[PDB]
Amino acid sequence: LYQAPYFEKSEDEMNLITKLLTHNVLFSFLNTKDIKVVAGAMQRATFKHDDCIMEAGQTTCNKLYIIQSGHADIIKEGQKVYLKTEGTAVGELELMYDTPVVATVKVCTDELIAWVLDRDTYRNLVMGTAIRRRETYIQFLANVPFLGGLDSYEKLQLADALSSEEFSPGEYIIHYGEEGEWLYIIMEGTVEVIGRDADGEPTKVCEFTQGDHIGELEFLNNHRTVADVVATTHVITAKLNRRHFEMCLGPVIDVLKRCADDPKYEYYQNVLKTGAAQPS
Ligand SMILES: Nc1nc2c(ncn2[C@@H]2O[C@H](CO)[C@@H](O)[C@H]2O)c(=O)[nH]1
Ligand SMILES: Nc1nc2c(ncn2[C@@H]2O[C@H](CO)[C@@H](O)[C@H]2O)c(=O)[nH]1
Numbered sequence: 001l002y003q004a005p006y007f008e009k010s011e012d013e014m015n016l017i018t019k020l021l022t023h024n025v026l027f028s029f030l031n032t033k034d035i036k037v038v039a040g041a042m043q044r045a046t047f048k049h050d051d052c053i054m055e056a057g058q059t060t061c062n063k064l065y066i067i068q069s070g071h072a073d074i075i076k077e078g079q080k081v082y083l084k085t086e087g088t089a090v091g092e093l094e095l096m097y098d099t100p101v102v103a104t105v106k107v108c109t110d111e112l113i114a115w116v117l118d119r120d121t122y123r124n125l126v127m128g129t130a131i132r133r134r135e136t137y138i139q140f141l142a143n144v145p146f147l148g149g150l151d152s153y154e155k156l157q158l159a160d161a162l163s164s165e166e167f168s169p170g171e172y173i174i175h176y177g178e179e180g181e182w183l184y185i186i187m188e189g190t191v192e193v194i195g196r197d198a199d200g201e202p203t204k205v206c207e208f209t210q211g212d213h214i215g216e217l218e219f220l221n222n223h224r225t226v227a228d229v230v231a232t233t234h235v236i237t238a239k240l241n242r243r244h245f246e247m248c249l250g251p252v253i254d255v256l257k258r259c260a261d262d263p264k265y266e267y268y269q270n271v272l273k274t275g276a277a278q279p280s
Contacts (some may be wrong), residue, residue: 070112168274183215189235223277
């Protein structure tokens with residue numbers, strides 16, 4: 001029965017805002033209508049350098065801010081600890097765990113333009129099962145090797161955008177020569193990567209299993225997929241959409257780019273030097 005506030009926006013505002021939402025993991029699993037209601041309930045909020053959007057200990061905030069342009073530091077006990085850039089959010093932690101502001105947010109650029117959501121609209125139309133989704137993945141993600149370089153906060157950020165994807169033996173996870181919109185982290189089962197050799201014929205490259213990742217090549221290097229990935233067993237994966245890849249795997253991209261060196265990626269090395277793929 002909840003009806004949200006509405007503040008009319010120009011056609012470019014709704015467009016701009018809707019884009020920030022579909023790339024911020026707080027809103028990953030909202031349908032199209034609820035994405036728009038949310039964009040109408042947002043409000044502009046501009047800040048200047050050294051301005052504080054919130055302060056450690058504050059109880060008077062209770063708002064979620066999505067950054068449009070500009071940066072802002074996270075300061076916990078006098079120490080800067082995190083830089084918040086465009087597309088990111090401050091305030092979600094207080095809204096999800098109902099506690100006073102834990103850290104101070106200090107604009108470190110000449111201006112900061114935010115879009116601000118009220119607690120009532122977030123808890124009723126966004127949050128959903130956020131805490132349970134976090135319970136589903138964090139212990140797993142904490143044990144996934146290539147995620148070593150995310151801190152607890154970043155793993156939770158990733159868990160907020162994850163959903164569970166199962167595959168039947170022999171079903172395609174990824175098809176050769178397609179755009180590809182998901183990275184997969186195997187939780188259970190085994191997969192085979194089926195490339196194409198010089199005459200264009202199927203060739204098996206390797207297998208992958210629990211804790212391995214597939215999908216990232218095309219996101220690192222902006223080409224269509226260069227292999228099939230097929231389940232050899234019943235497979236369970238957690239999956240991350242392409243629009244969330246950079247916002248969430250940012251601090252580990254460089255582990256991913258060791259695809260240039262690892263010999264399991266020798267197939268792909270040879271594909272890259274002969275230029276055998278198109279952008280997507
Ligand atoms: N990356 C990061 N951001 C935090 C942390 N603690 C708080 N924040 C951010 O600062 C806001 C106020 O505490 C939260 O809503 C988060 O957006 C932290 O430990 N790491
Ligand atoms: N281990 C390995 N995986 C590959 C290779 N080429 C492609 N893949 C996987 O197949 C997907 C589709 O190209 C990529 O995103 C990778 O996950 C390769 O040469 N070695």
